Design an enzyme around this catalytic site. Structure first.
Site, PDB file in Angstrom:
ATOM      1  N   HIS A  40       0.811  -1.224   0.000  1.00 25.29           N
ATOM      2  CA  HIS A  40       0.000   0.000   0.000  1.00 25.29           C
ATOM      3  C   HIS A  40       0.845   1.274   0.000  1.00 25.29           C
ATOM      4  O   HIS A  40       0.307   2.380  -0.202  1.00 25.29           O
ATOM      5  CB  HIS A  40      -1.056  -0.014   1.109  1.00 25.29           C
ATOM      6  CG  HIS A  40      -0.560   0.451   2.445  1.00 25.29           C
ATOM      7  ND1 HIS A  40      -0.198  -0.416   3.451  1.00 25.29           N
ATOM      8  CD2 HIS A  40      -0.417   1.698   2.950  1.00 25.29           C
ATOM      9  CE1 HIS A  40       0.162   0.278   4.519  1.00 25.29           C
ATOM     10  NE2 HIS A  40       0.044   1.562   4.237  1.00 25.29           N
ATOM     11  N   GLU A  52      19.201   6.867   8.807  1.00 23.22           N
ATOM     12  CA  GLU A  52      18.496   8.053   9.314  1.00 23.22           C
ATOM     13  C   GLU A  52      18.176   7.994  10.790  1.00 23.22           C
ATOM     14  O   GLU A  52      17.782   6.940  11.319  1.00 23.22           O
ATOM     15  CB  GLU A  52      17.164   8.231   8.576  1.00 23.22           C
ATOM     16  CG  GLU A  52      17.282   8.698   7.126  1.00 23.22           C
ATOM     17  CD  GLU A  52      17.568  10.183   7.019  1.00 23.22           C
ATOM     18  OE1 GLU A  52      17.997  10.786   8.043  1.00 23.22           O
ATOM     19  OE2 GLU A  52      17.366  10.745   5.929  1.00 23.22           O
ATOM     20  N   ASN A  54      17.227  11.771  12.594  1.00 24.33           N
ATOM     21  CA  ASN A  54      16.386  12.915  12.264  1.00 24.33           C
ATOM     22  C   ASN A  54      16.219  12.989  10.748  1.00 24.33           C
ATOM     23  O   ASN A  54      17.184  13.230  10.021  1.00 24.33           O
ATOM     24  CB  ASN A  54      16.973  14.223  12.822  1.00 24.33           C
ATOM     25  CG  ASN A  54      15.985  15.371  12.749  1.00 24.33           C
ATOM     26  OD1 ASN A  54      15.341  15.587  11.721  1.00 24.33           O
ATOM     27  ND2 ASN A  54      15.833  16.104  13.861  1.00 24.33           N
ATOM     28  N   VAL A  57      17.200  16.567   9.027  1.00 30.52           N
ATOM     29  CA  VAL A  57      18.551  17.131   9.139  1.00 30.52           C
ATOM     30  C   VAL A  57      19.539  16.089   8.666  1.00 30.52           C
ATOM     31  O   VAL A  57      19.438  14.920   9.065  1.00 30.52           O
ATOM     32  CB  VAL A  57      18.877  17.466  10.618  1.00 30.52           C
ATOM     33  CG1 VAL A  57      20.289  18.021  10.769  1.00 30.52           C
ATOM     34  CG2 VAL A  57      17.883  18.491  11.161  1.00 30.52           C
ATOM     35  N   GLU A  62      23.815   9.063   6.828  1.00 25.73           N
ATOM     36  CA  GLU A  62      22.831   8.697   5.827  1.00 25.73           C
ATOM     37  C   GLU A  62      23.426   8.100   4.565  1.00 25.73           C
ATOM     38  O   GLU A  62      24.556   8.407   4.162  1.00 25.73           O
ATOM     39  CB  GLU A  62      22.004   9.912   5.432  1.00 25.73           C
ATOM     40  CG  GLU A  62      21.185  10.521   6.555  1.00 25.73           C
ATOM     41  CD  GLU A  62      21.905  11.644   7.306  1.00 25.73           C
ATOM     42  OE1 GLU A  62      23.139  11.813   7.176  1.00 25.73           O
ATOM     43  OE2 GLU A  62      21.215  12.369   8.048  1.00 25.73           O
ATOM     44  N   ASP A  84      -0.090  -7.570   1.805  1.00 21.66           N
ATOM     45  CA  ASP A  84       0.397  -6.180   1.803  1.00 21.66           C
ATOM     46  C   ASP A  84       1.912  -6.151   1.949  1.00 21.66           C
ATOM     47  O   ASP A  84       2.458  -5.849   3.021  1.00 21.66           O
ATOM     48  CB  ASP A  84      -0.321  -5.356   2.894  1.00 21.66           C
ATOM     49  CG  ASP A  84      -0.017  -3.865   2.799  1.00 21.66           C
ATOM     50  OD1 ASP A  84       0.492  -3.430   1.755  1.00 21.66           O
ATOM     51  OD2 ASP A  84      -0.279  -3.120   3.779  1.00 21.66           O
ATOM     52  N   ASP A 171       0.567   1.966  19.744  1.00 24.80           N
ATOM     53  CA  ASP A 171       0.290   1.422  18.402  1.00 24.80           C
ATOM     54  C   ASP A 171       1.167   2.123  17.365  1.00 24.80           C
ATOM     55  O   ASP A 171       1.790   3.159  17.631  1.00 24.80           O
ATOM     56  CB  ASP A 171      -1.177   1.707  18.079  1.00 24.80           C
ATOM     57  CG  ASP A 171      -1.772   0.846  16.965  1.00 24.80           C
ATOM     58  OD1 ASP A 171      -1.131  -0.067  16.395  1.00 24.80           O
ATOM     59  OD2 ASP A 171      -2.953   1.110  16.675  1.00 24.80           O
ATOM     60  N   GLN A 174      -0.116   6.620  11.205  1.00 29.20           N
ATOM     61  CA  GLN A 174       0.074   7.099   9.838  1.00 29.20           C
ATOM     62  C   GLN A 174       1.518   7.508   9.623  1.00 29.20           C
ATOM     63  O   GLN A 174       2.068   8.284  10.405  1.00 29.20           O
ATOM     64  CB  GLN A 174      -0.868   8.295   9.610  1.00 29.20           C
ATOM     65  CG  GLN A 174      -1.025   8.708   8.150  1.00 29.20           C
ATOM     66  CD  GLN A 174      -2.112   9.757   7.938  1.00 29.20           C
ATOM     67  OE1 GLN A 174      -2.574  10.400   8.885  1.00 29.20           O
ATOM     68  NE2 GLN A 174      -2.522   9.932   6.688  1.00 29.20           N
ATOM     69  N   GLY A 175       2.127   7.003   8.549  1.00 30.53           N
ATOM     70  CA  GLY A 175       3.517   7.304   8.247  1.00 30.53           C
ATOM     71  C   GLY A 175       4.476   6.221   8.734  1.00 30.53           C
ATOM     72  O   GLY A 175       5.656   6.233   8.347  1.00 30.53           O
ATOM     73  N   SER A 177       3.614   3.015   8.168  1.00 31.92           N
ATOM     74  CA  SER A 177       3.315   1.948   7.208  1.00 31.92           C
ATOM     75  C   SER A 177       4.534   1.521   6.439  1.00 31.92           C
ATOM     76  O   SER A 177       5.363   2.337   6.054  1.00 31.92           O
ATOM     77  CB  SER A 177       2.255   2.408   6.221  1.00 31.92           C
ATOM     78  OG  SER A 177       0.999   2.393   6.861  1.00 31.92           O
ATOM     79  N   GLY A 178       4.640   0.224   6.223  1.00 29.05           N
ATOM     80  CA  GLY A 178       5.768  -0.308   5.490  1.00 29.05           C
ATOM     81  C   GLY A 178       6.966  -0.637   6.358  1.00 29.05           C
ATOM     82  O   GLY A 178       7.856  -1.366   5.931  1.00 29.05           O
TER      83      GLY A 178
HETATM   84  C1  LIG Z   1      -4.433   6.889   7.622  1.00 32.80           C
HETATM   85  O1  LIG Z   1      -4.672   7.384   8.955  1.00 32.80           O
HETATM   86  C2  LIG Z   1      -4.412   6.723  10.213  1.00 32.80           C
HETATM   87  O2  LIG Z   1      -4.263   7.426  11.207  1.00 32.80           O
HETATM   88  C3  LIG Z   1      -4.308   5.233  10.289  1.00 32.80           C
HETATM   89  C4  LIG Z   1      -2.919   4.914   9.805  1.00 32.80           C
HETATM   90  C5  LIG Z   1      -2.352   3.582  10.210  1.00 32.80           C
HETATM   91  C6  LIG Z   1      -1.510   2.967   9.295  1.00 32.80           C
HETATM   92  C7  LIG Z   1      -0.915   1.751   9.624  1.00 32.80           C
HETATM   93  C8  LIG Z   1      -1.174   1.175  10.857  1.00 32.80           C
HETATM   94  C9  LIG Z   1      -2.020   1.796  11.765  1.00 32.80           C
HETATM   95  C10 LIG Z   1      -2.264   1.159  13.094  1.00 32.80           C
HETATM   96  N1  LIG Z   1      -3.107   1.707  13.960  1.00 32.80           N
HETATM   97  N2  LIG Z   1      -1.640   0.032  13.430  1.00 32.80           N
HETATM   98  C11 LIG Z   1      -2.603   3.009  11.444  1.00 32.80           C
HETATM   99  N3  LIG Z   1      -5.128   4.555   9.308  1.00 32.80           N
HETATM  100  C12 LIG Z   1      -6.429   4.432   9.492  1.00 32.80           C
HETATM  101  O3  LIG Z   1      -6.982   4.875  10.489  1.00 32.80           O
HETATM  102  C13 LIG Z   1      -7.185   3.707   8.399  1.00 32.80           C
HETATM  103  N4  LIG Z   1      -8.377   3.065   8.949  1.00 32.80           N
HETATM  104  S1  LIG Z   1      -9.858   3.507   8.514  1.00 32.80           S
HETATM  105  O4  LIG Z   1     -10.752   2.992   9.490  1.00 32.80           O
HETATM  106  O5  LIG Z   1      -9.955   4.931   8.383  1.00 32.80           O
HETATM  107  C14 LIG Z   1     -10.136   2.808   7.080  1.00 32.80           C
HETATM  108  C15 LIG Z   1     -10.695   1.525   7.040  1.00 32.80           C
HETATM  109  C16 LIG Z   1     -10.939   0.885   5.827  1.00 32.80           C
HETATM  110  C17 LIG Z   1     -10.621   1.507   4.630  1.00 32.80           C
HETATM  111  C18 LIG Z   1     -10.908   0.779   3.334  1.00 32.80           C
HETATM  112  C19 LIG Z   1     -10.059   2.789   4.633  1.00 32.80           C
HETATM  113  C20 LIG Z   1      -9.821   3.433   5.861  1.00 32.80           C
HETATM  114 CA   LIG Z   2      19.002  12.708   8.696  1.00 32.69          CA
END
Ligand SMILES: COC(=O)[C@H](Cc1cccc(C(=N)N)c1)NC(=O)CNS(=O)(=O)c1ccc(C)cc1
Ligand SMILES: [Ca+2]
Length: 223
Positions: A40, A52, A54, A57, A62, A84, A171, A174-175, A177-178
């Protein structure tokens, strides 16, 4: 990462940042030429950033290396997030040292209850938005199938596992991921998805890397 801690510079030497003009995802260095990340996270124009701490900076350790190709799993289903996983090949080999190092693929799957290290430069807030510039870390356990299955209304497959705390507060977010989930000394997970971050009864879902070792090895053998 929500509810985690500052890792310390280069303490997670296999952690990479994927940059397309800005940090957008994490990844894991698995040998001098390959990064494992989430399908994704796919996009064109990826530069892999190794060594990396920071991300805003230049600190002196790096290595910035452009991707030559990205290979999304052949069965990645964006509807369900099943499979995924994505391999990214580097245009040139990383120089491996104490601050840039690879993480091995697993021989066996990690067990429920095992504590894992999750890391990344993602959002640190469960409510609202704050992005750290230095790498953040979280230690959390693998949950049972029962708890993981019952943890979302959405579809959960045998290629996903859950890590975290059902009470909330800790947990990935966002950011992140991967990026890596390291358990028992090997790359066991990839930060995949969740419902918000660190919410009660809503743990993180992770790609089960041990199910993909054959595909990874076959793919890197021919690319
Ligand atoms: C994108 O915004 C977010 O804050 C989290 C990100 C995220 C990414 C990876 C892992 C986690 C984690 N908590 N382990 C969180 N994603 C979401 O909140 C997305 N969920 S969601 O409920 O909004 C959602 C559900 C289903 C679809 C098809 C699209 C979006
Ligand atoms: Ca750096």
């Amino acid at each position: 990462i929500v509810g985690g801690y500052t890792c310390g510079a280069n303490t997670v030497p296999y952690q990479v940042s994927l940059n397309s003009g800005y940090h957008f995802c994490g990844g894991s260095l698995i040998n001098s030429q390959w990064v494992v990340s989430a399908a994704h996270c796919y996009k064109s124009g990826i530069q892999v950033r190794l060594g990396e701490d920071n991300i805003n900076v230049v600190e002196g350790n790096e290595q910035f290396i452009s991707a030559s190709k990205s290979i999304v799993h052949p069965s990645y289903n964006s509807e369900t997030y099943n499979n995924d996983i994505m391999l990214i090949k580097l245009k040139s080999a990383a120089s491996l040292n104490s601050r840039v190092a690879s993480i091995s693929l697993p021989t066996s799957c990690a067990s429920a209850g095992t504590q894992c290290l999750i890391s990344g430069w993602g959002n640190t807030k469960s409510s609202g938005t704050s992005y750290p510039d230095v790498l953040k870390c979280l230690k959390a356990p693998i949950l049972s199938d029962s708890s993981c299955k019952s943890a979302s209304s959405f579809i959960i497959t045998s290629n996903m596992f859950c890590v975290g705390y059902l009470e909330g507060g800790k947990d990935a977010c966002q950011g992140d991921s991967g990026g890596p989930v390291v358990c028992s000394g090997k790359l066991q997970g990839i930060v995949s998805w969740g419902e918000g971050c660190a919410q009660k009864n809503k743990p993180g879902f992770y790609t089960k890397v041990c199910n993909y070792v054959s595909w990874i090895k076959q793919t890197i053998a021919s690319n």
